[PDB]
């Protein structure tokens, strides 16, 4: 038919999302010490890619 969506299909993708849970991951420092952690990695530990990702299916 002309329309392929319905009100009955509401929340289709969010229901069938496989429901992964977050992992443990101990807390980062907060406040002034988190700015210390930002500064030491992007400056003291030497384009600059802030989030370089490992190679995937694009190459």
């Amino acid at each position: 038919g002309k329309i392929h969506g319905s009100l009955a299909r509401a929340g289709k993708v969010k229901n069938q999302t496989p429901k992964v849970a977050k992992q443990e991951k101990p807390k980062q420092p907060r406040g002034r010490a988190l700015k210390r952690l930002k500064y030491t990695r992007r400056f003291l530990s030497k384009k600059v890619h802030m989030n370089k990702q490992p190679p995937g299916k694009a190459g």
Partner: protein, 182 residues
């Protein structure tokens, strides 16, 4: 309702919140001076902006004008008093050349790092806020305390601090209780 106590704002957020040149300078200023947030930089912007604006109004005024002799000798006085300008700089054109790291060097977090009372600039901010530094036998717990020139001689440990001449702090004292029950 009938309360006339006044209050204003001391900082201002920048136009253009994502400038890659500006965001890189301010992360250097949060690292080189041990700052909590970008807002502590932004009041140092507004503090210096107001000095840079009044001193630029007074140069529109001629010399031997009443608002430039008075109140132009006030803004050169508070630069010399707080260490913003050394005593050679007396012409009022040097207030227009002040920078944000010229003001951030005068914070009590920086002098306690520069005088030698702490290993790092993040050691200094802890020891101020944990009541160890007295400026004139006055325990100052504010890191944004702008130290005057005459106050530099008298920064030391507090007389009530365990690092000075006071009683020993918590980890010795709660251990001295545990050795007492035995």
């Amino acid at each position: 309702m009938r309360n006339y106590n006044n209050f204003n704002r001391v900082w201002k957020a920048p136009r253009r919140p994502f400038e890659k040149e500006r965001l890189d300078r301010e992360m250097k200023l949060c690292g080189q001076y041990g700052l909590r947030c970008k807002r502590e930089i932004w009041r140092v912007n507004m503090t210096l902006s107001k000095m840079r604006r009044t001193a630029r109004l007074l140069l529109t005024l001629p010399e031997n004008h009443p608002r430039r002799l008075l109140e132009g000798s006030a803004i050169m006085r508070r630069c010399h008093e707080y260490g913003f300008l050394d005593e050679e700089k007396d012409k009022l054109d040097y207030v227009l050349s002040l920078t944000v790291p010229d003001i951030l060097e005068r914070r009590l977090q920086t002098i306690v790092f520069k005088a030698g009372l702490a290993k790092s600039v993040h050691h200094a901010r802890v020891l101020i806020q944990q009541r160890h530094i007295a400026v004139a036998k006055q325990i100052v717990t504010i890191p944004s305390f702008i130290v005057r020139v005459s106050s530099e001689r008298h920064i030391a440990f507090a007389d009530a601090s365990p690092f000075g001449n006071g009683r020993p702090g918590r980890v010795k004292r709660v251990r001295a209780k545990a050795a007492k029950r035995h």
